[PDB]
Design a protein around this ligand. Sequence first.
Ligand code: CA
Length: 223
Amino acid sequence: IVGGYTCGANTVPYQVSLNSGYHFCGGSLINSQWVVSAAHCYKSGIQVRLGEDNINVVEGNEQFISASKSIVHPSYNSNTLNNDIMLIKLKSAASLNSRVASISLPTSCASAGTQCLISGWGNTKSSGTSYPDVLKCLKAPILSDSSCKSAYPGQITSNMFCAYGLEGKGDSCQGDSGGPVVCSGKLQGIVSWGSGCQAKNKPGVYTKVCNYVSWIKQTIASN
Ligand SMILES: [Ca+2]
């Protein structure tokens, strides 16, 4: 997260870190057994880390639980990033508490102009590289679809939305991928792609979670 703020420990209790020997992506806890992330975060050998603030220090509220299965959306296209969503099942249910909590799925799609909360452990520089240890947060508005399409001609599908996010937060960044975009208390986006982090005229692009609620529900009912 570039241009954001320190969230505060466990203030984003649905935020997870995906670890394969190192943090590589975020995700969102949607119930005690399932995490939503980006399909482009897929790999084998995932450990889900819940209850994190500093990802480099064991602080006493963590739960580390290996994934038993990952399910990439059936129509994910890694070239275009269309349908950039995956589900990760935990080998054992998380213990839900004040520091480890699920986020609701949306009933309706969010509105242009709504301020959302984006979070993660990704790069905090637009130019160059610096990785935080504690969870970072950004408040960012959803942009109009016409604004989003003008920023990325020929690339924005109905399964994506943009969120300065045009002037350049100056955004989400490498290592935030897969993490949440929460608007009005619902998981509305997944950190997906953009051009750099320009953080002029290149806001972040996010998977539009409201399009996937049926798939999520049906998948978790059978797996
Ligand atoms: Ca920790």
